[PDB]
Amino acid sequence: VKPNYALKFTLAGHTKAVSSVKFSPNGEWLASSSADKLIKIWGAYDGKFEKTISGHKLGISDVAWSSDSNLLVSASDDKTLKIWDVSSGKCLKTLKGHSNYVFCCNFNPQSNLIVSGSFDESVRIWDVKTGKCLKTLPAHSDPVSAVHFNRDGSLIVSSSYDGLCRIWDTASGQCLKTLIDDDNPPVSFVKFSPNGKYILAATLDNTLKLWDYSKGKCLKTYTGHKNEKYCIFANFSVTGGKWIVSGSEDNLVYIWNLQTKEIVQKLQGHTDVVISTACHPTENIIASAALENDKTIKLWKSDC
């Protein structure tokens, strides 16, 4: 009925706001990025600090893992993305092309491609092996807040302060669908459901929405949290109960029942905006991370 997530670890070490936390696909590691220009790797189950990955000249907005858990990509205000070999910590490639801060990034499931979103209003698709830009999509008319590939990499979904959610054919770059409600508040997040049939989208009117984009219809609305200013990451949690999980600008992690939309738990502990949450791929484990009055990551664990 309800989870019972309890605090297990507080991961200290970043010196500015944390921007993003992500579990490796094999579940072994958490990676974190921060305004302090650094990536940090931590053990997912014992919270143990592993190493620092350095090289960006300005703060990092996002980090993402390849499917084999061997590479990371980061997006930075220095207008580049970097591909990192996690074991060595070396920068394998620097991805130049964006004309302003890069804000979001992701590998596709095969992990031969990376997608980025930028303040320059564009979405780019990059070849992992060469570090070259394959396509620049004129995706939006304001900064792009999130980019995500669907389950097999055949589609990209993007969101922008322009109020729109768009879905793109990866191979061609053709826009297959624009989602818009009668109202156009800035869309601060978007991602595909694990089965790729639905889309979870956050807008800066304190609202999360689950969209059936085959039919272009909003099915669920989740409220009660605070989200009017920041681009906060949300997630589907599928390892036990089927929940929706998001950060909030009242320093809490919110957890909703996906089907009934009822708030099932609120996680208190952070002392600043909870900007990012990640759900563990196999265990009922949540990582949360907060802005610069806090600077820590928290690992939580529930029985369902």
Side-chain angles (χ1 to χ4, degrees), residues 18-89:
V18 187
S19 54
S20 185
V21 291
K22 306 281 177 66
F23 289 106
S24 60
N26 68 3
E28 191 182 353
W29 306 105
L30 186 72
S32 56
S33 65
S34 163
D36 76 352
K37 321 175 181 174
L38 307 174
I39 298 166
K40 286 176 183 281
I41 308 297
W42 321 78
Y45 310 115
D46 61 7
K48 218 206 163 263
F49 171 76
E50 180 73 20
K51 67 169 143 259
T52 300
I53 290 174
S54 54
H56 275 298
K57 331 262 271 163
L58 293 171
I60 303 168
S61 286
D62 206 359
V63 68
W65 290 93
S66 66
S67 304
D68 61 7
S69 314
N70 284 325
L71 307 179
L72 289 164
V73 61
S74 50
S76 175
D77 275 16
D78 67 17
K79 306 189 288 232
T80 74
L81 299 104
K82 283 177 182 283
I83 304 179
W84 305 93
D85 181 274
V86 187
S87 293
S88 72

XYZ file of all heavy atoms in Angstrom, residues 18-89:
545
model
N 24.459 19.919 -5.647
C 24.393 18.732 -6.469
C 23.364 19.019 -7.555
O 22.371 19.720 -7.313
C 24.029 17.491 -5.633
C 24.144 16.255 -6.516
C 24.967 17.307 -4.402
N 23.626 18.564 -8.771
C 22.662 18.727 -9.860
C 21.945 17.439 -10.251
O 20.806 17.507 -10.719
C 23.342 19.318 -11.106
O 24.481 18.578 -11.536
N 22.555 16.279 -10.042
C 21.992 15.082 -10.656
C 22.641 13.845 -10.061
O 23.859 13.811 -9.903
C 22.206 15.103 -12.173
O 21.561 14.002 -12.773
N 21.824 12.826 -9.762
C 22.314 11.525 -9.327
C 21.658 10.446 -10.181
O 20.478 10.552 -10.534
C 22.054 11.282 -7.822
C 22.935 12.221 -6.999
C 20.572 11.463 -7.467
N 22.433 9.409 -10.515
C 21.976 8.308 -11.357
C 22.659 7.029 -10.905
O 23.883 7.020 -10.748
C 22.314 8.540 -12.831
C 21.832 9.851 -13.455
C 20.369 9.787 -13.803
C 19.901 11.121 -14.353
N 20.542 11.434 -15.639
N 21.878 5.958 -10.753
C 22.433 4.621 -10.520
C 22.959 4.036 -11.825
O 22.359 4.199 -12.898
C 21.372 3.677 -9.907
C 21.036 4.014 -8.472
C 19.828 4.617 -8.149
C 21.961 3.783 -7.456
C 19.546 4.967 -6.828
C 21.693 4.124 -6.145
C 20.478 4.712 -5.824
N 24.097 3.367 -11.732
C 24.596 2.615 -12.859
C 23.604 1.514 -13.214
O 22.862 1.017 -12.356
C 25.949 1.999 -12.527
O 25.818 1.131 -11.412
N 23.552 1.127 -14.481
C 22.580 0.108 -14.883
C 22.789 -1.232 -14.189
O 21.800 -1.906 -13.896
C 22.783 0.046 -16.402
C 23.192 1.475 -16.746
C 24.128 1.834 -15.634
N 24.026 -1.601 -13.842
C 24.214 -2.839 -13.080
C 23.913 -2.680 -11.593
O 24.036 -3.665 -10.849
C 25.640 -3.397 -13.282
C 26.737 -2.520 -12.669
O 26.467 -1.501 -12.039
N 27.993 -2.947 -12.835
N 23.518 -1.482 -11.140
C 23.166 -1.257 -9.754
C 24.324 -1.038 -8.802
O 24.089 -0.818 -7.608
N 25.562 -1.044 -9.289
C 26.712 -1.084 -8.398
C 27.040 0.286 -7.827
O 27.479 0.387 -6.671
C 27.921 -1.617 -9.148
C 29.078 -1.942 -8.259
C 30.237 -2.414 -9.076
O 30.037 -2.596 -10.302
O 31.328 -2.596 -8.498
N 26.846 1.335 -8.629
C 27.376 2.656 -8.331
C 26.280 3.701 -8.414
O 25.345 3.596 -9.212
C 28.479 3.103 -9.311
C 29.644 2.174 -9.479
C 29.901 1.363 -10.544
C 30.657 1.899 -8.503
N 31.050 0.634 -10.312
C 31.530 0.947 -9.067
C 30.924 2.385 -7.220
C 32.652 0.465 -8.384
C 32.040 1.913 -6.544
C 32.889 0.960 -7.128
N 26.421 4.729 -7.599
C 25.754 5.984 -7.863
C 26.788 6.951 -8.416
O 27.929 6.990 -7.943
C 25.115 6.541 -6.600
C 24.257 7.777 -6.776
C 22.954 7.382 -7.469
C 24.020 8.340 -5.393
N 26.401 7.700 -9.444
C 27.206 8.814 -9.928
C 26.498 10.126 -9.613
O 25.265 10.207 -9.673
C 27.463 8.727 -11.432
N 27.271 11.148 -9.273
C 26.702 12.460 -8.996
C 27.475 13.545 -9.726
O 28.696 13.467 -9.888
C 26.649 12.765 -7.483
O 27.916 12.675 -6.826
N 26.736 14.560 -10.163
C 27.315 15.746 -10.771
C 26.902 16.943 -9.925
O 25.927 16.878 -9.176
C 26.821 15.921 -12.215
O 25.417 16.163 -12.264
N 27.608 18.058 -10.093
C 27.432 19.166 -9.169
C 27.901 20.428 -9.862
O 28.673 20.383 -10.824
C 28.203 18.918 -7.854
O 28.382 20.107 -7.089
N 27.401 21.561 -9.366
C 27.902 22.856 -9.779
C 29.386 23.019 -9.483
O 30.024 23.925 -10.042
C 27.108 23.951 -9.079
N 29.958 22.164 -8.618
C 31.367 22.287 -8.262
C 32.303 21.740 -9.341
O 33.507 21.615 -9.090
C 31.618 21.629 -6.894
C 31.653 20.104 -6.958
O 31.342 19.518 -8.017
O 31.952 19.485 -5.918
N 31.762 21.446 -10.530
C 32.454 20.989 -11.734
C 32.914 19.534 -11.661
O 33.691 19.109 -12.520
C 33.669 21.863 -12.097
C 33.559 23.388 -11.904
C 34.935 23.997 -12.220
C 34.984 25.499 -12.051
N 36.381 26.042 -12.230
N 32.443 18.750 -10.693
C 32.971 17.409 -10.473
C 31.888 16.347 -10.567
O 30.706 16.595 -10.303
C 33.648 17.287 -9.101
C 34.725 18.295 -8.732
C 35.167 18.089 -7.274
C 35.895 18.154 -9.689
N 32.321 15.146 -10.941
C 31.522 13.944 -10.868
C 32.089 13.108 -9.734
O 33.306 12.988 -9.595
C 31.563 13.166 -12.199
C 30.971 14.016 -13.335
C 30.838 11.820 -12.063
C 31.278 13.476 -14.715
N 31.220 12.533 -8.923
C 31.705 11.644 -7.889
C 30.995 10.307 -8.037
O 29.825 10.251 -8.434
C 31.517 12.285 -6.496
C 32.525 13.399 -6.244
C 32.329 14.130 -4.911
C 33.342 15.249 -4.805
N 34.688 14.749 -4.415
N 31.738 9.230 -7.786
C 31.224 7.864 -7.815
C 31.168 7.353 -6.389
O 32.109 7.567 -5.611
C 32.110 6.954 -8.690
C 32.316 7.584 -10.064
C 31.566 5.493 -8.738
C 31.010 7.734 -10.834
N 30.058 6.689 -6.049
C 29.809 6.170 -4.716
C 29.242 4.756 -4.821
O 28.441 4.470 -5.714
C 28.803 7.040 -3.949
C 28.900 8.549 -4.113
C 28.462 9.309 -5.175
C 29.382 9.471 -3.134
N 28.679 10.650 -4.919
C 29.251 10.772 -3.676
C 29.947 9.323 -1.858
C 29.652 11.898 -2.985
C 30.346 10.450 -1.184
C 30.197 11.713 -1.743
N 29.618 3.889 -3.885
C 28.984 2.585 -3.791
C 27.495 2.655 -3.503
O 27.079 3.382 -2.598
N 26.659 1.935 -4.264
C 25.225 2.155 -4.128
C 24.674 1.573 -2.835
O 23.651 2.066 -2.330
C 24.470 1.574 -5.324
N 25.306 0.518 -2.295
C 24.748 -0.232 -1.171
C 25.400 0.093 0.169
O 24.745 -0.044 1.209
C 24.850 -1.744 -1.432
C 24.322 -2.122 -2.795
C 25.155 -2.649 -3.781
C 22.983 -1.934 -3.106
C 24.652 -3.002 -5.028
C 22.476 -2.277 -4.349
C 23.313 -2.810 -5.306
O 22.793 -3.138 -6.540
N 26.657 0.544 0.168
C 27.328 0.987 1.391
C 27.638 2.475 1.398
O 28.260 2.958 2.349
C 28.624 0.185 1.638
C 29.654 0.331 0.515
O 29.470 1.146 -0.404
O 30.673 -0.392 0.548
N 27.199 3.215 0.384
C 27.420 4.658 0.301
C 28.869 5.117 0.200
O 29.167 6.324 0.253
N 29.781 4.164 0.046
C 31.214 4.432 0.112
C 31.695 5.299 -1.041
O 31.561 4.919 -2.209
C 31.981 3.110 0.105
C 33.187 3.090 0.991
C 34.192 2.084 0.457
C 35.530 2.335 1.059
N 36.460 3.155 0.207
N 32.312 6.441 -0.724
C 32.935 7.253 -1.762
C 34.004 6.456 -2.507
O 34.860 5.808 -1.891
C 33.541 8.520 -1.164
C 34.388 9.293 -2.142
C 33.801 10.070 -3.144
C 35.770 9.232 -2.079
C 34.593 10.759 -4.046
C 36.551 9.916 -2.974
C 35.964 10.678 -3.957
N 33.937 6.488 -3.843
C 34.858 5.744 -4.698
C 35.914 6.627 -5.362
O 37.109 6.366 -5.196
C 34.092 4.952 -5.761
C 35.041 4.156 -6.662
C 35.661 2.947 -5.979
O 35.114 2.471 -4.950
O 36.712 2.474 -6.475
N 35.513 7.636 -6.144
C 36.497 8.582 -6.672
C 35.822 9.848 -7.181
O 34.595 9.938 -7.282
C 37.333 7.997 -7.811
C 36.556 7.702 -9.065
C 37.548 7.393 -10.144
C 37.051 6.317 -11.029
N 37.636 4.974 -10.739
N 36.666 10.824 -7.509
C 36.264 12.068 -8.153
C 36.745 12.087 -9.593
O 37.881 11.696 -9.883
C 36.842 13.276 -7.420
O 36.370 13.266 -6.071
C 36.403 14.576 -8.085
N 35.871 12.532 -10.492
C 36.167 12.642 -11.911
C 36.128 14.119 -12.277
O 35.101 14.778 -12.080
C 35.178 11.826 -12.749
C 35.447 10.334 -12.529
C 35.264 12.207 -14.193
C 34.440 9.418 -13.202
N 37.236 14.636 -12.797
C 37.389 16.077 -12.988
C 37.793 16.404 -14.418
O 38.390 15.585 -15.123
C 38.448 16.655 -12.037
O 39.691 15.963 -12.163
N 37.504 17.646 -14.826
C 37.911 18.119 -16.136
C 37.061 19.219 -16.748
O 37.572 20.013 -17.550
N 35.777 19.279 -16.398
C 34.934 20.365 -16.885
C 35.399 21.697 -16.296
O 35.905 21.754 -15.170
C 33.464 20.097 -16.535
C 32.751 19.233 -17.536
N 32.578 19.602 -18.849
C 32.134 18.031 -17.405
C 31.908 18.671 -19.495
N 31.622 17.701 -18.640
N 35.229 22.777 -17.067
C 35.699 24.090 -16.639
C 34.637 24.889 -15.901
O 34.970 25.912 -15.281
C 36.199 24.889 -17.841
C 36.754 24.033 -18.949
C 38.253 23.961 -18.858
C 38.895 25.093 -19.632
N 40.316 25.268 -19.212
N 33.390 24.422 -15.929
C 32.260 25.027 -15.242
C 31.365 23.917 -14.717
O 31.614 22.729 -14.951
C 31.478 25.977 -16.163
C 32.250 27.226 -16.589
C 31.480 27.994 -17.675
C 32.438 28.082 -15.356
N 30.303 24.313 -14.015
C 29.479 23.337 -13.311
C 28.773 22.380 -14.251
O 28.546 22.643 -15.428
N 28.412 21.231 -13.705
C 27.805 20.150 -14.463
C 26.330 20.086 -14.085
O 25.986 20.216 -12.904
C 28.526 18.821 -14.182
C 30.013 18.953 -14.502
C 27.916 17.685 -15.032
C 30.857 17.770 -13.967
N 25.456 19.969 -15.102
C 24.015 19.912 -14.900
C 23.457 18.493 -14.890
O 22.348 18.297 -14.389
C 23.278 20.702 -15.990
O 23.400 22.116 -15.783
N 24.163 17.524 -15.473
C 23.589 16.192 -15.663
C 24.687 15.181 -15.942
O 25.739 15.505 -16.492
C 22.590 16.192 -16.831
C 21.533 15.107 -16.719
O 21.541 14.301 -15.753
O 20.662 15.057 -17.603
N 24.407 13.929 -15.602
C 25.349 12.859 -15.856
C 24.509 11.680 -16.303
O 23.331 11.574 -15.945
C 26.211 12.574 -14.582
C 25.364 11.981 -13.471
C 27.400 11.702 -14.903
N 25.092 10.797 -17.112
C 24.321 9.618 -17.505
C 25.240 8.438 -17.774
O 26.377 8.603 -18.211
C 23.445 9.884 -18.741
N 24.713 7.240 -17.542
C 25.470 6.002 -17.671
C 25.162 5.263 -18.968
O 24.018 5.244 -19.435
C 25.156 5.043 -16.537
C 25.616 5.376 -15.196
C 24.915 6.046 -14.254
C 26.824 4.936 -14.568
N 25.628 6.109 -13.094
C 26.808 5.441 -13.252
C 27.931 4.201 -14.998
C 27.850 5.225 -12.345
C 28.983 3.974 -14.087
C 28.931 4.490 -12.777
N 26.186 4.613 -19.514
C 26.006 3.653 -20.587
C 25.482 2.333 -20.029
O 25.579 2.056 -18.830
C 27.318 3.415 -21.321
O 28.263 2.785 -20.459
N 24.945 1.500 -20.931
C 24.255 0.284 -20.508
C 25.193 -0.705 -19.839
O 24.763 -1.460 -18.962
C 23.561 -0.367 -21.701
O 22.691 0.582 -22.303
N 26.458 -0.740 -20.242
C 27.385 -1.679 -19.601
C 27.978 -1.138 -18.300
O 28.817 -1.816 -17.691
C 28.510 -2.066 -20.576
C 29.353 -0.872 -21.022
O 29.161 0.245 -20.488
O 30.239 -1.071 -21.892
N 27.565 0.061 -17.874
C 28.029 0.722 -16.656
C 29.500 1.104 -16.709
O 30.114 1.342 -15.663
C 27.779 -0.132 -15.408
O 26.472 -0.677 -15.395
N 30.090 1.159 -17.900
C 31.510 1.472 -18.030
C 31.816 2.918 -18.387
O 32.936 3.369 -18.125
C 32.165 0.576 -19.079
C 32.400 -0.796 -18.565
O 32.696 -0.959 -17.380
N 32.289 -1.800 -19.434
N 30.871 3.637 -18.991
C 31.079 5.014 -19.412
C 30.062 5.932 -18.748
O 28.959 5.518 -18.386
C 30.963 5.152 -20.935
C 31.808 4.231 -21.817
C 31.524 4.521 -23.278
C 33.296 4.403 -21.523
N 30.446 7.183 -18.573
C 29.512 8.231 -18.193
C 29.532 9.314 -19.264
O 30.518 9.469 -19.990
C 29.897 8.851 -16.847
C 29.743 8.087 -15.540
C 30.542 8.769 -14.436
C 28.281 7.999 -15.174
N 28.452 10.085 -19.352
C 28.475 11.344 -20.082
C 28.027 12.432 -19.116
O 27.154 12.195 -18.276
C 27.578 11.324 -21.342
C 26.096 11.074 -20.974
C 27.733 12.625 -22.124
N 28.611 13.619 -19.238
C 28.222 14.760 -18.414
C 27.874 15.939 -19.316
O 28.437 16.073 -20.402
C 29.356 15.213 -17.477
O 30.589 15.382 -18.181
N 26.980 16.813 -18.846
C 26.652 18.063 -19.539
C 27.036 19.236 -18.651
O 26.673 19.258 -17.472
C 25.166 18.135 -19.887
N 27.723 20.227 -19.234
C 28.347 21.297 -18.476
C 27.994 22.655 -19.054
O 27.661 22.797 -20.233
C 29.884 21.173 -18.452
O 30.469 22.288 -17.803
N 28.109 23.652 -18.188
C 27.986 25.054 -18.548
C 29.145 25.519 -19.424
O 29.086 26.630 -19.981
C 27.927 25.878 -17.263
C 26.539 25.962 -16.691
O 25.669 25.158 -17.086
O 26.336 26.761 -15.763
N 30.201 24.714 -19.553
C 31.284 25.070 -20.456
C 30.937 24.761 -21.906
O 31.809 24.894 -22.784
C 32.596 24.395 -20.020
C 32.572 22.882 -20.165
O 31.699 22.352 -20.894
O 33.437 22.212 -19.540
N 29.678 24.360 -22.150
C 29.021 24.191 -23.446
C 29.423 22.882 -24.104
O 29.003 22.623 -25.229
C 29.271 25.367 -24.405
C 28.900 26.709 -23.780
C 28.932 27.862 -24.787
C 30.359 28.211 -25.163
N 30.626 29.665 -24.995
N 30.188 22.036 -23.426
C 30.563 20.732 -23.951
C 29.874 19.619 -23.167
O 29.357 19.825 -22.065
C 32.088 20.546 -23.902
O 32.521 20.313 -22.559
C 32.805 21.798 -24.420
N 29.854 18.437 -23.773
C 29.685 17.195 -23.041
C 31.011 16.450 -23.010
O 31.850 16.608 -23.899
C 28.613 16.314 -23.670
C 27.250 16.992 -23.665
C 26.862 17.519 -25.065
C 26.192 16.060 -23.040
N 31.207 15.653 -21.972
C 32.390 14.807 -21.894
C 31.938 13.370 -21.685
O 30.979 13.116 -20.950
C 33.349 15.278 -20.783
C 34.164 16.520 -21.224
C 35.083 17.084 -20.130
C 35.827 18.332 -20.619
N 36.960 17.988 -21.514
N 32.592 12.453 -22.407
C 32.471 11.016 -22.201
C 33.640 10.575 -21.330
O 34.803 10.888 -21.628
C 32.464 10.263 -23.542
C 31.347 10.786 -24.464
C 32.332 8.764 -23.311
C 31.301 10.090 -25.824
N 33.342 9.831 -20.276
C 34.336 9.452 -19.282
C 34.442 7.937 -19.226
O 33.424 7.235 -19.236
C 33.966 9.976 -17.891
C 33.732 11.462 -17.798
C 32.538 12.115 -17.913
C 34.726 12.482 -17.596
N 32.727 13.489 -17.786
C 34.059 13.730 -17.587
C 36.113 12.464 -17.429
C 34.739 14.946 -17.415
C 36.784 13.675 -17.257
C 36.093 14.896 -17.248
N 35.666 7.433 -19.136
C 35.883 6.033 -18.795
C 35.903 5.967 -17.275
O 36.812 6.512 -16.639
C 37.187 5.505 -19.376
C 37.412 4.045 -19.038
O 37.965 3.751 -17.959
O 37.050 3.195 -19.880
N 34.900 5.316 -16.692
C 34.728 5.389 -15.250
C 35.895 4.730 -14.524
O 36.394 5.264 -13.534
C 33.373 4.785 -14.840
C 33.131 5.029 -13.369
C 32.237 5.441 -15.649
N 36.353 3.575 -15.010
C 37.416 2.843 -14.325
C 38.685 3.679 -14.222
O 39.318 3.749 -13.161
C 37.694 1.534 -15.064
O 36.581 0.670 -14.964
N 39.073 4.318 -15.318
C 40.265 5.155 -15.347
C 40.005 6.593 -14.924
O 40.916 7.252 -14.414
C 40.863 5.140 -16.753
O 40.034 5.892 -17.627
N 38.790 7.094 -15.110
C 38.514 8.490 -14.851
C 38.958 9.430 -15.952
O 38.830 10.652 -15.794
